[PDB]
């Protein structure tokens, strides 16, 4: 059927994550983990975690073969941003947005 895994308040910017998520969307689940292990980006490990949890939820709660599971969807959504401040010069000060993201992945057999 379909099995999802969501990771919430992952402390990475969401458009530093959609870079990687634009790769493994539509792919098989084997090459997906291959890519997510081989890539240089810092979003790969957390997305490795999430995609492996998606596959495990499939094979444990829904019992669909972990051989034909294709990543139907994968997307990041914004989250609660931590707003910080940085001392500029001459007494000024500039905001900083330590933003977060919610990483959802949905693997489905396609049947």
């Amino acid at each position: 059927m379909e099995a999802k895994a969501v990771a919430r308040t992952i402390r990475i910017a969401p458009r530093k994550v959609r870079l990687v998520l634009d790769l493994i969307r539509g792919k098989n689940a084997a090459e997906a983990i291959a890519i997510l292990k081989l890539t240089n980006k810092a979003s790969s490990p957390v997305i490795e975690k999430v995609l492996m949890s998606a596959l495990a939820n499939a094979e444990h709660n829904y019992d669909m073969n972990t051989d034909e599971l294709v990543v139907k969807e994968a997307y990041a959504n914004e989250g609660p941003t931590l707003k910080r401040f940085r001392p500029r010069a001459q007494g000024r000060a500039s905001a900083i947005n330590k933003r977060t993201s919610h990483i959802t992945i949905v693997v489905s057999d396609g049947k």
Binding site: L19, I35, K37, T39
Partner: protein
């Protein structure tokens, strides 16, 4: 200088047309059984054998 006019959310996405990152250019290891990255040592099990 400073921007004279705020950028639409069309021109933005057009400029981010090329903000991709390609895949690494990987292969499968004939020994390890899994995906390695070509011209590199196999992550999983050991050898290179080139």
């Amino acid at each position: 200088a400073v921007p004279k006019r705020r950028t639409s959310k069309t021109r933005k996405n057009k400029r981010r047309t090329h903000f991709k990152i390609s895949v690494p250019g990987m292969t499968e290891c004939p020994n390890c059984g899994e995906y390695k990255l070509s011209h590199r040592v196999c992550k999983n099990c050991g050898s290179y054998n080139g």
